[PDB]
């Protein structure tokens, strides 16, 4: 029941500014992304014509 | 009546035969940009475009402009006045579609397939 596997991200984001989402890249850019509500990956046929059934 | 007899029976001056030739080339993109237009809009079907040919449609509009280009300047090289008032809008004519075939291009940006 304890064996497992686990990724380590290597992005170091802190919860907290995870909660908030405006983590900065030491530059200016966004470490966190908040999604469309909605939302579901493209398809292969273009970026606009979803085809998964996965919902986020 | 003597300027049809003349040519009916044999070939053409060099103007005419270029000029019209993107003629039928503006009604063959006619068609097609018109499906492609029409398949985006109407029946909103994304699937029956262009896009497997999106090259080759660009590349025949080159052409199309450049053969009118060659064309008018010997009507007017000529000076023939319904030449002159004629090809002038086919080389505007097809510079109308080829700036809509390219608008219809970056609309459909998201809607082709992925390269970058």
New interface residues.
């Given amino acids: 029941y304890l064996r497992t596997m686990h990724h380590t991200p290597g992005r170091h984001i802190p919860p907290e500014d995870w909660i908030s989402g405006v983590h900065k890249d030491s530059q200016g850019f966004n470490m966190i992304k908040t999604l469309p509500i909605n939302y579901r990956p493209p398809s292969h046929m273009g970026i606009s014509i979803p085809l998964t059934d996965n919902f986020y | 009546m003597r300027w049809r007899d003349r040519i009916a029976v044999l070939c053409f001056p060099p103007g005419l035969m270029l000029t019209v030739a993107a003629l039928i080339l503006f009604f063959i993109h006619m068609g097609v940009f018109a499906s492609d237009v029409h398949n985006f809009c109407v029946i909103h079907n ?2 029956h475009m262009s896009f497997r040919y999106t090259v080759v449609l660009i590349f025949s509009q080159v052409i199309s402009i450049g053969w009118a280009a060659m064309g008018s300047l010997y009507a007017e090289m000529t000076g023939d006045k319904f030449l002159r008032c004629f090809a002038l809008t086919i080389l505007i004519l097809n510079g109308a579609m080829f700036f809509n075939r390219l608008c219809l291009e970056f609309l459909a940006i ?5 390269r970058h």
């Fill in positions: 994304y699937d998201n809607y082709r397939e992925e």
